[PDB]
Amino acid sequence: STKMQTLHKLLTGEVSFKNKAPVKDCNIVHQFGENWATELSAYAKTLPAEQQKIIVRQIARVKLTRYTVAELAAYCGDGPALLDETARAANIEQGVAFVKAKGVEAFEKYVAEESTNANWKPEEAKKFIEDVKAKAK
Amino acid sequence: ISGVSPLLYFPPTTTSTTNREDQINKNTNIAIQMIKRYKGEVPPHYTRKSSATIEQVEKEIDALLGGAEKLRKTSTDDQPMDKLTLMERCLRHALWSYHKEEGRYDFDQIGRWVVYTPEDEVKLAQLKREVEAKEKLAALRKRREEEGLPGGPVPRINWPQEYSSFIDREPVVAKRIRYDTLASTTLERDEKQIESTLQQYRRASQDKRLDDLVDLLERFKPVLAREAIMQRLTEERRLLPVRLRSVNEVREIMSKTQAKKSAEAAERNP
Amino acid sequence: VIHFLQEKRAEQKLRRVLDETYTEWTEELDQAHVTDAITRSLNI
Amino acid sequence: RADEVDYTNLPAPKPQKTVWDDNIETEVLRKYLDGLSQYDMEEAKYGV
Amino acid sequence: SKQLTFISAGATAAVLQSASAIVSKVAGGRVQTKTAKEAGRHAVVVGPETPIGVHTAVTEVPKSAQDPLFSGVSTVVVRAVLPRAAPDSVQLRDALDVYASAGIDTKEEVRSATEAFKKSAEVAVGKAKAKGVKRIVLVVKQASKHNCINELFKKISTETIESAGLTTEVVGTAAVANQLIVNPESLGVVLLNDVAATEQIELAFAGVVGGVSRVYHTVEGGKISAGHSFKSVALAVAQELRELGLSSEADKVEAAASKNPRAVVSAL
């Protein structure tokens, strides 16, 4: 009960972190857990409609907050709903350029290293590499 | 780095074609602009009274000293000097003060004829260290360019450690962007244009110094003529103590004058 | 004795000529600031 | 049933000063590299 | 007969071509569309980069184009823009901080920066008074490098605002960016000092809201529209056409931008 209340207050902005650190998706995932969104959505159902709408809106905004400011500026120009696809296309184009620049095997190793650093599932990395290879030809 | 990031960080290379020549030209224009602002305004043009190349002046000094060397007796530093030694020092000091500005750094003669005060010794040490460092840096950058390594400096970092350390990726990605852009650019300036601008700035002073050196040589020649004439043949309280100064006293007097000039320069700015 | 006084006067002139001379070290804009300006211009 | 955790507490991001290899190109640019390191540490502390 | 001036600043050729096609298809040829690098009126600037001749960089949240996520929000983000020199020359925002370190005199640059900051602060206080807010939020990057431009920015903006009678709350860049993206209803008017990070923050806010057109106030006196993506450029062109005195065409462009962001030209 306390965890959900604290999360609701934090997202609503009533209570900030100890050091007034920004309320980003990364920090929330670090503290509350990987699946904070699901538990928060389940808990919100026990609240009036206004609080439910506020919770949904705040969750959406926090999810938008998962990108750096530069990425949002470059890719979110034409709306937030189209942000994910534009970012994915830009990343795929960068991958294609890297492949055409410095081969494939080195590209495979680099993608593996970045997936290790970027906290990506092996399935997602494999899908990304296959997609970029298919886009090449 | 908790939280699945949405994008993989490929190198920031998007300017696939960025010719090194254009980057060096921009780095030269910026350097010229900053140097012009720092120096101020070009000094007013100065017209030499007598046109005589520095080479001819050096030849004349060498010839005069070689001819008059007969009277060259060595003495201790704390000993009164001879007219010949005084003339030699007064001429070579101007000659080497000119050569140092002109850019011909010869740290063997400059350390003997131009350095008199400890401040001068410190300045000479700094100048020599800077010149050697610039030479080494230029050679190392040329070798690096031949090999093909990135022109700019690269820090000793292990980004797999940094990703783990920081919680949020944004500062780490920003740092990677900054350092990759730094290592993808050549912080090299075209020293020909810089030296040309500096030369244009230090033209009135050099010509004035050369004219002063010519005048000094023409004024010293009669004294040697009189000394040779006397050699071939063979109120007063003010002129009794007069004597040529010992080298150490010359060093101290030069230190006093230099400190006075430094104080005046410092007071000028406020 | 006028010769002696004239000789002392000539030596005094030479001594004054030597004393007035002083090495003059110039200061030039450190290139580190130029490098910093170049870095800033890159938007880094 | 005592206190469990202060969910509003975040371990501050421990910064690390970037270290440059010791060459002539570092001694010549010592001041500039030190400035870059200071800027990096300030960015790490404040956030961007 | 008439003229719309297109300024290109770091925009991909696709965006410029789309803007030209949109204007040609909507206007019908009555108003011509010339390209240049500077203007004072009837001008649309395309691309993230800041054009030459603009001193203020205001952006709002238009009611019509509000994204469902940001419905009802009302916060004005004004970025102060210092005069822009040629790309090769050292920009004022960097000269004002590097010359002081190098010891060079910084009188004329300080004067120009003071004039620019006074104009931007006047714009910000006008907006705040119009909206009715009582306090404005200054945004300064807290890096040690920018320890002189931001100091002058504060010293002048707070001076002018207090002379006008409002209160100022200074803040860094990360906190204000996060607050603006997550909880923007708690900020009424936010001024931004001139730094690259502040430009990126302004672009991020203008995009996250759903894509809007940023207004630039120039030295000559006037307003020129600005966009960086297809929807933002379409909205900027719609606003420009409205300013020229075309209502139905502006409404059509706005509706097309709302419906089909990336392919407005074919949509309308």
Residue numbers in the entry:
A (entry chain h): 21 to 157
B (entry chain d): 17 to 250, 290 to 325
C (entry chain c): 71 to 114
D (entry chain M): 208 to 255
E (entry chain g): 2 to 269
Reported in the publication:
Using masked refinements, maps were obtained for the membrane region, the rotor, and the peripheral stalk. The trypanosomal peripheral stalk displays a markedly different architecture compared to its yeast and mammalian counterparts. By contrast, T. brucei lacks the canonical bH2 and instead, helices 5-7 of divergent subunit-d and the C-terminal helix of extended subunit-8 bind to a C-terminal extension of OSCP at the apical part of the peripheral stalk. The interaction between OSCP and subunit-d and -8 is stabilized by soluble ATPTB3 and ATPTB4. The peripheral stalk is rooted to the membrane subcomplex by a transmembrane helix of subunit-8, wrapped on the matrix side by helices 8-11 of subunit-d. Apart from the canonical contacts at the top of F1, the peripheral stalk is attached to the F1 via an euglenozoa-specific C-terminal extension of OSCP, which contains a disordered linker and a terminal helix hairpin extending between the F1-bound p18 and subunits -d and -8 of the peripheral stalk. Lack of bH2 in T. brucei also affects composition of the peripheral stalk in which the divergent subunit-d and subunit-8 binds directly to a C-terminal extension of OSCP, indicating a remodeled peripheral stalk architecture.
